[PDB]
Amino acid sequence: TTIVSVRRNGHVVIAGDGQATLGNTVMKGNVKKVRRLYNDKVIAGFAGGTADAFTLFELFERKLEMHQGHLVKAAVELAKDWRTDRMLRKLEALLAVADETASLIITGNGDVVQPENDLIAIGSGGPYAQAAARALLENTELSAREIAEKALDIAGDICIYTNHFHTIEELSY
């Protein structure tokens, strides 16, 4: 799959495709890889278990609960539980979460990464997404949503594991 987050001006987005693959066949084509959390204040995307995500997004949203809402802290506190607990440690998936403050990547390896210009591109198509998301953010005035989306379509074109079904979320401030 491919998830692409971009942040320009007062907008930050997270777009993802809808293909779910098994072997060499497409299982589903309209999977919802992006969603809103923490009273719509937080937007996130996931690459992997359509349920593993569920479990994760919630716990994450449990971190933001009694930690004011500090995106970064609750994010590192999550990867912490994630890499520890046998339960959490069991599930595998790439997490891409953003918010007014900043966007970052969370992984099972208890890793909390924040790409260069808050530009995230995970999933089997992340590279393609990023290469295109770059060429644009670099030589274009296009909005965060226009790049995320245009970059996402480019990925879908190259990546055999990503389709052109989008699911975008945004955040304005």
Binding site: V76, E77, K80, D81, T84, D85
Partner: protein, 393 residues
């Protein structure tokens, strides 16, 4: 009519070397309790103890200062290990116990303090009882109203011949533990300690830093922070149920103590940080500090040892160099092995004197002089040999 901070620091200097800031800090806390009593009903309520948090390594004075402070104020004092309560996640114990245990000791106080503020008088009246059995001398009326009035005459001579001279002695003691009691009021005595605990109580919480955090693990941090949580009421002001009544922690002074090498005071839970307005650091001691600790405190271990040997009729004298050589020994072991602060002086000093301490009863009448030589003769080997150190010093 309490002493001023400088005066408090001074008394403290009589027992603790260095660590001046911690003194001033603990000094202001005390003075403020006086300052509080000096206000209007209104303010007396709002003004809460300015609790302190001591930050520093092992055995460099933290507790001693707290203990000497309490003594100076004659305040009931109690020391407690924070981690004790993390065990409650198994069985442990509850924190309220701190205020309860405090009260028990605050009673053991008021009692022994009272039984003493009476044992004298109870001994005199005791005489009049015995002296009464030998002779009711005088009485209302009986003879002359002036010259023949005073009965003392015989009684007096009888008295003296008794004080200096059933069983009068056996009987008196039974009368001492009969008149003293009949003079103590157990009701005001029980409420006595309670007023103390509430007005002067001092709680020393060691290891507060072993109750912080670190992404270590979910389970352990929860229990840790649990003890902090359970500590809030005691520190924010609450009511605890005591075997001798109910107590209001609201004015008990709290001195929390932490090394804080792994964890920081900022890791403490917010409601507690706000209740530890005073933060103070204590420094690691230096060999110099050791030398001074060895002899300066007005009841230093060296002065102590001197007295014990005198008890055996043996005059012990320490040489300046001997003292320096001793301090050096303690320092070296602390660095070569495990650093345990001034505590090490006690072990070293004590090993240095084993032979004398045993032979003392036979050396009666001699002039032993512990000098640099003697010290090196007895310690160097041990000090040098590390493994031996870990067992012997």
């Amino acid at each position: 009519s309490e002493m001023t901070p400088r005066e408090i620091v001074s008394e403290l200097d009589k027992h603790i070397i260095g660590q001046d800031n911690a003194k001033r800090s603990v000094a202001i806390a005390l003075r403020n309790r006086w300052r509080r009593m000096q206000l209007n009903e209104e303010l007396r309520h709002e003004v809460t103890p300015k609790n302190i948090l001591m930050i520093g390594p092992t055995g460099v004075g933290k507790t001693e200062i707290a203990r000497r402070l309490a003594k100076l104020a004659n305040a009931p004092f109690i020391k407690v290990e924070a981690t004790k309560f993390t065990e409650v996640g198994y069985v442990g114990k509850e924190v309220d116990s701190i205020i309860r245990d405090l009260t028990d000791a605050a009673v053991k106080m008021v009692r022994v303090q009272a039984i003493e503020k009476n044992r004298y008088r109870a001994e005199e009246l005791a005489e009049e009882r015995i002296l009464d059995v030998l002779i009711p001398p005088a009485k209302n009326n009986w003879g002359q109203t002036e010259q023949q009035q005073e009965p003392s005459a015989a009684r007096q001579a009888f008295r003296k011949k008794l004080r200096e001279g059933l069983k009068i002695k056996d009987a008196m003691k039974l009368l001492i533990e009969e008149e003293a009691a009949k003079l103590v009021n157990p009701e005001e005595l029980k409420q006595d300690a309670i007023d103390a605990v509430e007005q002067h109580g001092i709680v020393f919480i060691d290891e507060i830093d072993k109750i912080c955090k670190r992404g270590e693990s979910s389970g352990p941090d929860v229990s840790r922070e649990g003890v902090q949580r359970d500590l809030l009421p005691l520190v924010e002001g609450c009511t605890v149920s005591t075997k001798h009544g109910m107590v209001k922690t609201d004015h008990i002074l709290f001195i929390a103590s932490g090394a804080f090498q792994i964890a920081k005071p900022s890791d403490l839970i917010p409601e507690l940080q706000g209740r530890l307005p005073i933060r103070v650091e204590l420094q690691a001691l230096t060999t110099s500090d050791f030398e001074r600790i060895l002899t300066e405190p007005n009841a230093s271990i060296t002065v102590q040892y001197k007295a014990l040997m005198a008890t055996e009729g043996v005059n012990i004298e320490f040489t300046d160099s001997g003292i320096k050589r001793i301090a050096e020994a303690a320092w070296q072991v602390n660095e070569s092995t495990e650093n345990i602060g001034a505590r090490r002086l006690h072990t070293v000093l004590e090993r240095l004197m084993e032979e004398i301490s045993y032979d003392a009863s036979d050396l009666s009448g001699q002039n032993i002089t512990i000098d640099a030589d003697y010290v090196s003769k007895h310690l160097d080997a041990l000090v040098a040999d590390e493994d031996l150190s870990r067992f012997i010093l």
